[PDB]
Design a protein around this ligand. Sequence first.
Ligand SMILES: [O-]S([O-])([O-])O[C@@H](CO)[C@H](O)C[S@+]1C[C@@H](O)[C@H](O)[C@H]1CO
Ligand SMILES: *[C@@H]1O[C@H](CO)[C@@H](O)[C@H](O)[C@H]1NC(C)=O
Ligand SMILES: [Zn+2]
Length: 1014
Amino acid sequence: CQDVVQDVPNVDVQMLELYDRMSFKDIDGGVWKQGWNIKYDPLKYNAHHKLKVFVVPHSHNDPGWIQTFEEYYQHDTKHILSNALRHLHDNPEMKFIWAEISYFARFYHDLGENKKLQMKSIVKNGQLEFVTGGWVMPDEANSHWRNVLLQLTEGQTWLKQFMNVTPTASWAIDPFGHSPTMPYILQKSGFKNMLIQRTHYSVKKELAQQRQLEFLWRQIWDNKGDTALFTHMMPFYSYDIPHTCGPDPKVCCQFDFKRMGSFGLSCPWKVPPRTISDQNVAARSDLLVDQWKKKAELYRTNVLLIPLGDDFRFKQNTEWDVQRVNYERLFEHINSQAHFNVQAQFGTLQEYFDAVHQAERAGQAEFPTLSGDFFTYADRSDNYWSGYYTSRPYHKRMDRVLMHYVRAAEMLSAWHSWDGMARIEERLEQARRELSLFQHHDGITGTAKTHVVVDYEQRMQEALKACQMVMQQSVYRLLTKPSIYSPDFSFSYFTLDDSRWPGSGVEDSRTTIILGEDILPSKHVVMHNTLPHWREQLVDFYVSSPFVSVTDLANNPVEAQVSPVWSWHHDTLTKTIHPQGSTTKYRIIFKARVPPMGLATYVLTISDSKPEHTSYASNLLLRKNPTSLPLGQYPEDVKFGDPREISLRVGNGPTLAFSEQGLLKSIQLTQDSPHVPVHFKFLKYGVRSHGDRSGAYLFLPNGPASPVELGQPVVLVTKGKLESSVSVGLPSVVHQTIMRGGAPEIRNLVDIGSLDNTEIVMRLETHIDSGDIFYTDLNGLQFIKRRRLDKLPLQANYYPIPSGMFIEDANTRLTLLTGQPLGGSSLASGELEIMQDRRLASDDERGLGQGVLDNKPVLHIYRLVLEKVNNCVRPSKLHPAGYLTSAAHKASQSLLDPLDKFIFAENEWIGAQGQFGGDHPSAREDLDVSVMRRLTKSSAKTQRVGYVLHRTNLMQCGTPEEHTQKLDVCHLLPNVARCERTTLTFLQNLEHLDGMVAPEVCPMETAAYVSSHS
Ligand SMILES: [O-]S([O-])([O-])O[C@@H](CO)[C@H](O)C[S@+]1C[C@@H](O)[C@H](O)[C@H]1CO
Ligand SMILES: *[C@@H]1O[C@H](CO)[C@@H](O)[C@H](O)[C@H]1NC(C)=O
Ligand SMILES: [Zn+2]
């Protein structure tokens, strides 16, 4: 295994180092506004060395943006695909590339058999070529790598089954900045090449000057280069025709033949295209070839890529004709005029890359190596696209909830083969496709119109219901004696209980377990643990009495804590935000211990008085002018006091101190240690009153944030043996710090209300001497070093926080893990900050045509880990990566993949068993079974199950290793007949494994395996 910590890779271009050296000046470059006047030597190409030009027709089809997926399909995409089929069928030399398989599958399934056969023929013959082949072209900033892989697999599995092709070239022309997680996944999925477009204009200028727009993109920790993927970065401001033929858009616009008038389009540079004729073709070719030769100067081979397309293009038959015929007249002239020394033709993306590599193998070019990312993007001036790291945060959080539900449903149902009548494959395909759709770069990014966001939300709600159905049917089968198991596949044997989604204060969605002497004495509950190691976690349920005790199925008592159910209300009469307690529902909390990838059953029983093994939390309301808070049968009366500082400690965990406003002020790790200053603060950013306005995409603050005025907020303190917490009702946020014995959990119920042109940020202030360095993750896969640059504006220093961020000095680190992707930064030494929500009245001029005024309450979740790191073996000062500690990684897993909780719905569960998975190996803590998916339906004689195994890399800080068993996923199911290592999409077998054993993977590596069973 390569060492991912101690060896700094030697690359030609390292983006953090490049950023430190670049000046980012926004100077007027002439017709190429963000470049320079390109010069070329006419003698470079000649009879023996021609410029080969591939014009690649394309149509960018967003799966929802300004219209829903179905609206665009009916109004635009079905016509584009129908006319592409007709035009390509009738014109053998014409080509076209297609990226979004969600639309292609929606079209293909509605085609009659004759047309399906025609479509297969134009794909098999190379006229229509799929690029990437994912369900969507995903966002790369907020998306979790697991979902990037899910959507890639959904599209490529469809293509392999119906079109018999698997793309090896990727096309990503629209995500708003680019992540190295893409080449990581693509290279492990059989890809050989990829293309990107939206990178900072200063980066395009810098790389173009050095002819470094094509590079071998490797991961930041990869010393050897085995992760490298050839990448082509486009050079110009857009993927539209005016910015793809060459440097001067006023010229290139004249070669978009859809802009002459009858189509409702024109050239903003005020010179229109003119139909090519024998009388103007020589002058028109002179102009076009000059643009091509200038673009070719920015690259190293004699093969040039000229994309020809835009949003929802190639819709009308007349458009296909006007583009094709005019370009064919130009090719016939150009290719017959020896003085140009050019051979131009329509081509596909793969044809371009194959020709580039032929040139490379002939020794005509060598390419530079590069590591790093391409965030934060700016397309012009100071317009940095860091707003979408937070926009529509409710749906960003929903993404992570559904991510976990899809994994748990696929894993729980994989253990058995299911009859078709159970509809398991049907529900899982629906859930995978809705979650995959939301990965679109106008989905999770929060950049779609309001009614489109509603459509994505409704699709994800249906997907969550599908996952619940599959999970509860699977639990009933896994934990019932087989000769008693009697399923009705439409029945709800269990209901899921989720304490953090939608969340208290967001939706009253949780069911209360109703117990009573005259109705039902007890109730079975079951926890599922999707992670491959034994895990304990506190779990809570609502119950109708405070006198409840817990037992396991061997009837052993389990220690439990009962607390009240508190709900916060913005009281419009008293004008205060304060909590109300229930006098008939209570929370019972206990530690569940669950096997690796397994299940554990417990029983909740009512008694007429306080049970021996259940304790009750005390509650203290700190506020001036208190009023009583009765809690029914709850045995401890609520206490009151004026606001004051308070300190709490659960178990042997840290001691946390809080200000009189209910906000953390310090953390003391052990009995003797210092109370380390760590303070939470909420602030607000505004919008500029002149100049460019923030919107869904852009963050354009009117200066540093201002503190939210807190008034004298009401603070609720709950102190229990198993769980304690401090909650405070602040303007727009009920902020809660929860302690269970380790790093605290933070929950914010964020309701920005009607505060227009406001972005609410949560900041942590410490005295850690971090300087200008901080770390943020990329897609939940890796942590990258960031350097705050005071030569760039505030919004350029914001980065995506898809799952966590940290600051550190020689001795101390503070890590904030998140349960949802949000934007954040470290704007000063010792600080971390993360945006909670943003409400913006204005459109930001990127085509959305609206502000962001559809905010709704969202419950954000976090874990806050303060640690000593002076003993940790960390990368050297020049290494571009960082790595979590064991505690921080476990805290992130507690947010993203918590235990699932199931409540038995009927009165009696006949044949119930106490546990499933007790014999499953408990793997080392850095290893995860990211995906477990049965790949065959029940009629297949040879069943196949796919696994994606990922090992992260955790710092070595002095804790002895201990235990753990080797995990061989190929032997998790019985009767294994074969084990194969495959691409990550499961579509190609790469290695037949000796002894049917699937080896574990190295740190930072991900592998896929398929076991076959007879
Ligand atoms: O013409 S528009 O639609 O206003 O904007 C463009 C060219 O002007 C963009 O390239 C359309 S892209 C399409 C959509 O996926 C992105 O949200 C948009 C960000 O701007
Ligand atoms: C699928 O494509 C392969 C080549 O990639 C070809 O040999 C095969 O016949 C095609 N159809 C089948 C058999 O699946
Ligand atoms: Zn797009």
